[PDB]
Design a protein around this nucleic acid. Sequence first.
DNA 1: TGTATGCAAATAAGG
DNA 2: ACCTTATTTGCATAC
Length: 131
Amino acid sequence: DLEELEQFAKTFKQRRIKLGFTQGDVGLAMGKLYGNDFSQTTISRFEALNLSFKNMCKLKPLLEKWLNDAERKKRTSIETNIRVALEKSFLENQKPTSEEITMIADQLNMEKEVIRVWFCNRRQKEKRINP
DNA sequence: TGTATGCAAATAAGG
DNA sequence: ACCTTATTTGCATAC
């Protein structure tokens, strides 16, 4: 429930730093503990209660565990120019075909997947511009 | 050097 | 497969 997490977040911040652990370590420690590591950003945000109640309830355990006991694909950096060609392409055809997508990943040196996702995100951005 | 944060990739859930 | 939709999560960078 509410306060329960309110506190856990706090005591966790104390114990963590006292034990000589940066959010950076804490994140990556869970890496060699569960598979998916957590960037410093997520750790910081969890401490500052800067996350959704659900995400907060989801993360408490994982962390809480780590605390006492101790006592995902890499983000593709879409470059400015590729982002442009992508935008150009989108302006011509919003919902590209699988093969078309493949064709683009081919001409733009990047993984096919990063493109399908971009086209889905773009269609989402588009909705926020024209409901 | 550690920590905060804005933008946007990537994801989970359900067709 | 692969979509929409809502949300989770990390890069990059300025305190």
